[PDB]
Amino acid sequence: TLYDYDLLSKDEKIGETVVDLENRLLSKFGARCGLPQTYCVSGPNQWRDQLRPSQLLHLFCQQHRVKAPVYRTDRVMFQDKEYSIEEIEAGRIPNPHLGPVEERLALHVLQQQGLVPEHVESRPLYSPLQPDIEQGKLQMWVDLFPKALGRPGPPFNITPRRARRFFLRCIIWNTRDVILDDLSLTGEKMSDIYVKGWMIGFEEHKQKTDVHYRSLGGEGNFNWRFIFPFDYLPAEQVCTIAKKDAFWRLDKTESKIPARVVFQIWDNDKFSFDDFLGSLQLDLNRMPKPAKTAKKCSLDQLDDAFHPEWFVSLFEQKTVKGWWPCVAEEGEKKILAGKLEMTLEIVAESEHEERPAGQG
C-alpha cells in the first residue's frame, strides 16, 4: 500500500494491491524475474544462478521437457538444434560485459525460451475509499530468489538517479590578446579588462576576476575558481537547473528549453563606458571538447549549431580544459569577440569531491 507522508497533512493511503506469492514460488517458466538479453556478472545484465549453469539448465530443461545445451563441443545441441556462441553474438551488439562460457551460454539459451524479458511494470494505485479508481501509477518489478537450491545471484542495481549538483569549476587561467572596441586617441592601448561569467540558474553567483593595473600585455594570473553546482543527469543527458524554484521536488530538475543557452553578461569598464567587446556564453550540458590550440580560433568553430556532435560524456576525463571564443553581447552571433582560456567540466558523475582536489 502507498501513502502520502507529508509533514503538513495526514498520510492517507494512495494505493492498494494484493499479491499471491505462490505462483512465483513453484513456477517452472522463470519469467517471474527480469531476463535481459545481455550477459554480465553485475548491473542490469547480471547473471542470476543459484547453481552452476550446467545444473540449472539440466533441471530447467527437465521441467520444460527439452534438451539442455550440456555440450561444449564444436557442435553443441540445444533441443536437437545447433548451438554456439557465434550464433548468439551474431545479430547482436558486441558485449563488453560477456563473461564465463558456461554462464553466458546459459543466459543466452534461456533467452530462446518464451519468457518475459527484463521489464518494469506500472501498477495502478487504488484508494481504500475508491478501490476501483486509480489515484496514480507506480513503476516497479519483482524478482524471486529461492533458497531451495543454492543462492541465486544478486538483485539488479537500481541506485536512484535524483537531483545532482555538478562541481563545475570555472577556472580562469589568464587574460591575453585582448580585443577592444573602445580605443584610445593617443595610440596607447589600455582598458579595464577582466573576465566575468556564470552558469545558467546562478545569476546571483555571478563572479569576475579583478582588474590588472600597470599592465599593458595583460600580464598576471589570478587562477580564480567559480563554482556553479548545476543540475544534470548523465543517464538522460538533459540540460537541467539546480537551485530550482520547483520547491515541490528534491528530485532531478526537468524542463523544456530551446536548443540554445543565453547568458546576461556585460562589460563594465570602470574608467570608461561599457565596451561591447564580447561575453562568454557556453552550454556546459551539451559542451564540445575544449580546444587545445589557438588554431581553432576561426570562423568555422564559432557555430554552436554546427557542433551538437558531442552528445557524449566528458565525465570520464580527469579535466575538461581548453580555449573557448567570446561572443558580442548582441545575442549568440557567429562572430569572434574576444578569447578566453579556462576550465569548464562536468565530472561529478563519478568524482564530485575528489577530482577537484587536484587543483584546490
Partner: protein, 81 residues
C-alpha cells in the same frame, strides 16, 4: 563504482526505454532491450496459463445443499490440481 555504467546501467536503460525526448542519453546507441510494462501481476500473463499449472486456486464454503438456512461464507484458499 564502474565508469562504464553511465552507458551500460539500469537507470540509463530505464530512461532510454521510456523514450523521453532529449532524456534517453546515449543509451539508445547500445541496442538495449526495451522494457516491457504490465498493469497487473506478471503471474496473470496468459502465456504461462496464469502460472496455475503446478497448482490452481480453489475456495471452501460453509453453505449446504440440503437446507436454505446455512450461510455459504468463504473459508479460505486451497492450492492444488
Amino acid at each position: 563504482p564502474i565508469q562504464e555504467e553511465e552507458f551500460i546501467d539500469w537507470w540509463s536503460k530505464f530512461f532510454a526505454s521510456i523514450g523521453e525526448r532529449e532524456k534517453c542519453g546515449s543509451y539508445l546507441e547500445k541496442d538495449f532491450d526495451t522494457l516491457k510494462v504490465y498493469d497487473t501481476q506478471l503471474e496473470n500473463v496468459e502465456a504461462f496459463e496464469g502460472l496455475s499449472d503446478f497448482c490452481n486456486t480453489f475456495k471452501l464454503y460453509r453453505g449446504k445443499t440440503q437446507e436454505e438456512t446455512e450461510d455459504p461464507s468463504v473459508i479460505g484458499e486451497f492450492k492444488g490440481l
